């Protein structure tokens, strides 16, 4: 029993964090094999990059300075070729995630990991993270068996306090640029499939007060969900929620009628899993993983 | 900007997780130097649990009865001793991944990270607090026994908790790394219920200061209060008494924000009376009590 916001064990990623300094700027880098990946703003970017030489980039892995032997740019990420391959390089992949998907963030300052938290790619492509100056280059990941899938690299904080970044191939999530200009996060929406998964986690944990005898059509639910700035629920989401529906005996459209009532009437002084708001940062897979105990 | 429930990087603890099997029971152990620490109930059967005589059960065990597995390598047990409710299994190999560590016993209200493990394999990390009733609101399934709670301070891991059991309400009970249980709990399947839980007042105040540091001032008011009047109100909402130690501990945050502790106490009194009126504080509709004054300072600066 118990439902916590749980991050993946960060160990395989900690062994990859390095500090990258160029000029007056110090930020974090991800050392995988003989390459260090970091935000290109550490330095027209190709014009500024041409002016740089290998020895301008100081890379520090703990108390050992790594020597840069090459540099290239891929979209908004700078790839610093180093002479030493990271012996702690885990089995990894670079994956691009979709909005609504969750991942763990290993927040780092000066190439030193300081915290790990779980978060979701918001539908507006920002992440509601926890970062301070020096956190740039901190990464987002998921762990599947023994494979670390790197999905995010922190690049900036938007004026509202939310964060924007790229996948490990340097492509930004969202309509952002790594430049000094007026940029704002779009209006955010609630990740509907995630709230439903969290309602199933609540049922698995013995919280049934919000359940009702009613069901709804997918279309009537979407008409209501659109009113409360909830993401449309697709047939794929309904299919993805299948296992939780089978385990609890509550059909997805049955749980949708519960969600509809919660949106129209509120919680009435009641909580669900210790929360007075509907939580949307647990995917259906996170709920199954935490209410089954999959290990890494 | 931003305020998240943040756990410590779990790497230094992952390299210490081992699987301990005794008969039909399999749970987690903490391999530090040449010793594996685990709950002593690993020697019990489900029947033995009502009234186990641990010394009687342990005297009947030999080293080879304990199977210890570190990844895909079986460790050889060369000795065993019991210290309170923890079993210490001496092994023939020192863990090369042993970090700089200490065993610390924490007080209620203190927070720590939990590396939840099953079969000696870490599956997740979360942050939580020692509740005033000495339980932890964790996320544990069967096989998580021996999962540890820790803090990391200057490359040093301070182990403060080892998971032992789940109480009937869904909350968890366990010991420090010297085998002493937190609270009045025993590693016996007897009628044990967690006492009525209260809100960690000093932590809610710290979280209100984190909100002010992050630009959220809507809940502040022109009032101040005496420490005694605040405690009389706080008791009525099942909030822990705020001591002069708590007021002193909140000093740095009071100096940084310019809001005196008793001034913030008056805001808390008003929040308790009014509720949030559809508003949130740091993305939360409830008053958060699992961030200590030390966590707020570490995360916001
Ligand atoms: C009902 C009874 C016939 N049996 C069925 C088989 O499992 C028995 C059981 O609960 N075992 C543990 C290991 C336990 O509670 N550990 C766990 C730790 N964390 C989360 C848990 C979530 C679900 C289940 C167990 C959890 C136990 C039991 C009694 C004591 Cl006194 C102690 Cl110290 C530890 C209860």
Catalytic residue selected from A16, A22, A38, A41: A41
Q: Are residues A42 and A79 in the same domain?
A: yes
CA distance A221 to chain B (A): 24
Cα separation values, A42 from A38, A155, A165, B170, B209, Å: 8, 10, 14, 48, 33
Q: Are residues B10 and B142 in the same domain?
A: yes
Q: Give, using CA atoms, the residue closest to atom 26 of ligand 1.
A: B142
Task: Tell me, in Å, the resolution of the deposited structure.
Answer: 2.0
Q: How far is the CA of A284 from the centre of ligand 1 (A)?
A: 26
Q: Are residues A157 and A10 in the same domain?
A: yes
Q: Are residues B113 and B6 in the same domain?
A: yes
- A136 an active-site residue? yes
Q: In 10 A of CB A72, how many CB atoms?
A: 11
Q: Are residues A247 and A177 in the same domain?
A: no
Q: Please report the number of interchain residue pairs, chain A to chain B, with beta-carbon separation below 8 angstroms.
A: 132
Q: Are residues A32 and A58 in the same domain?
A: yes
Q: Radius of gyration of chain A from Cα atoms?
A: 21
- According to DSSP, the residues that pair with B173 across neighbouring strands are B165
Q: Are residues B10 and B152 in the same domain?
A: yes
Sign of CA dihedral A98, A101, A103, A108: positive
Asked if B112 and B150 count as a contact pair (C-beta separation under 8 A), the reply is yes
Q: Are residues A6 and A100 in the same domain?
A: yes
Looking only at the bridges linking them, the beta strands covering B100-103 and B156-166 are parallel
Asked if A4 and B147 count as a contact pair (C-beta separation under 8 A), the reply is no
b/e sequence A84-99, b meaning 16+ C-beta within 10 Å: eebebbbebebbebeb
CA distance B56 to chain A (A): 32
B49 token code pair: 């649990």
DSSP conformational letter for B78: E
Q: Give, using CA atoms, the residue closest to atom 27 of ligand 1.
A: B165
By what technique were these coordinates determined? X-ray
Q: Are residues B168 and B64 in the same domain?
A: no
Catalytic residue selected from B16, B22, B38, B41: B41
Picking from B36, B20, B13, the residue whose alpha carbon sits closest to that of residue B114 is B13
Final residue belonging to a domain, choices A188, A213, A246: A188
Q: How far apart are CA A248 and CA A205, in angstroms?
A: 10
Q: Give, using CA atoms, the residue closest to atom 6 of ligand 1.
A: B46
* In the block, residue with structure tokens 């009437």: A265
Q: Are residues B42 and B128 in the same domain?
A: no
Task: Locate the DSSP E strands across chain B.
Answer: 17-22, 25-32, 35-39, 66-70, 73-75, 77-83, 86-91, 100-103, 111-118, 121-129, 148-153, 156-166, 172-175
- Cα B246–chain centre separation: 19
Q: How far is the CA of B145 from the centre of ligand 1 (A)?
A: 9
A265: left (phi over 0), alpha (psi -120 to 50) or beta: alpha
Q: Are residues B112 and B9 in the same domain?
A: yes
Q: Which residues contact B93 (CB under 8 A, 6 or more apart)?
A: B34, B70, B75, B76
Pocket test for ligand 1, best of B43, B189, B190 (most atoms within 8 A of CB): B189
Q: Give, using CA atoms, the residue closest to atom 34 of ligand 1.
A: B165
Q: Are residues B94 and B121 in the same domain?
A: no
Q: Give, using CA atoms, the residue closest to atom 12 of ligand 1.
A: B165
- A163 an active-site residue? no
Final residue belonging to a domain, choices A188, A220, A248: A188
Instruction: Supply the range of the domain harboring residue B36.
Output: 15-99
- Mark yes or no for CB contact B139/A106 under 8 Å: no
Q: How far apart are CA B231 and CA B229, in angstroms?
A: 5
Q: How far apart are CA A182 and CA A198, in angstroms?
A: 36
Picking from B284, B237, B211, B282, the residue whose alpha carbon sits closest to that of residue A276 is B284
Q: How far apart are CA B219 and CA B208, in angstroms?
A: 9
CA distance B12 to chain A (A): 7
Q: How many helical (H) and strand (E) elements, i.e. helices and strands, does chain B have?
A: 8, 13
- Mark yes or no for CB contact A116/B10 under 8 Å: yes
Collapsed DSSP state (helix, strand, coil) of residue A117: strand
Q: How far apart are CA A114 and CA B298, in angstroms?
A: 9
Q: Domain of B289: which CATH number?
A: 1.10.1840.10
Instruction: Give the closest of A6, A11, A117 to B139, CB-based.
Output: A6
Final residue belonging to a domain, choices A156, A188, A220: A188
Q: Domain of B58: which CATH number?
A: 2.40.10.10
Asked if B45 and B57 count as a contact pair (C-beta separation under 8 A), the reply is no
Structural domains in chain B (count): 3
Catalytic residue selected from B22, B145, B160, B265: B145
Q: How far apart are CA B272 and CA B93, in angstroms?
A: 55
Instruction: Give the closest of A2, A11, A131 to B139, CB-based.
Output: A2
Catalytic residue selected from A22, A76, A108, A136: A136
* In the block, residue with structure tokens 């399934």: B141
Instruction: Give the closest of B2, B128, B139 to A130, CB-based.
Output: B2
Helices (H), chain B: 11-14, 54-59, 201-213, 227-236, 244-249, 251-257, 261-274, 293-300
DSSP conformational letter for A183: -
- For residue A14, give the chain B residue with the closest CA: B11
Which residues does a chain break follow in chain A (C to N more than 2.5 Å)?
Answer: 43
Q: How far is the CA of B166 from the centre of ligand 1 (A)?
A: 6
């Amino acid at each position: 029993s118990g439902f916590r916001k749980m991050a993946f064990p960060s160990g395989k990623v900690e062994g990859c964090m390095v500090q990258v300094t160029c000029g007056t700027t110090t930020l974090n880098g991800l050392w995988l094999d003989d390459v260090v990946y970091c935000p290109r703003h550490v330095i027209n970017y190709e014009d500024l990059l041409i002016r740089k030489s290998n020895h301008n980039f100081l890379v520090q892995a703990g108390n050992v300075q790594l020597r840069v032997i090459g540099h290239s740019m891929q979209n908004c990420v700078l790839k610093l070729k180093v002479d030493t391959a990271n012996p702690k390089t885990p089995k990894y992949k670079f994956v691009r995630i979709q909005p609504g998907q969750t991942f763990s963030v290993l927040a780092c300052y000066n190439g030193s990991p300081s915290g790990v938290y779980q978060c979701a790619m918001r539908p507006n492509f920002t992440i509601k993270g926890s970062f301070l100056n020096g956190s740039c280059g901190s990464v987002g990941f998921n762990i599947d068996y023994d494979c670390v899938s790197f999905c995010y690299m922190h690049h900036m904080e938007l004026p509202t306090g939310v964060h924007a970044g790229t996948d490990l191939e340097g492509n930004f999530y969202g309509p952002f640029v790594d430049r000094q200009t007026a940029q704002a996060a779009g209006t955010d929406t609630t990740i509907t499939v995630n709230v439903l998964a969290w309602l199933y986690a609540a049922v698995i944990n013995g919280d049934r007060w919000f359940l009702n005898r009613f069901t709804t059509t997918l279309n009537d639910f979407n008409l209501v969900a659109m009113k409360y700035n909830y993401e449309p629920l697709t047939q794929d989401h309904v299919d993805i929620l299948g296992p939780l529906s089978a385990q609890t005996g509550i059909a997805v459209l049955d749980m949708c009628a519960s969600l509809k009532e919660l949106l129209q009437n509120g919680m009435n002084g009641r909580t669900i899993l210790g929360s007075a708001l509907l939580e949307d940062e647990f995917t259906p897979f996170d709920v199954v993983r935490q209410c089954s105990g999959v290990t890494f």
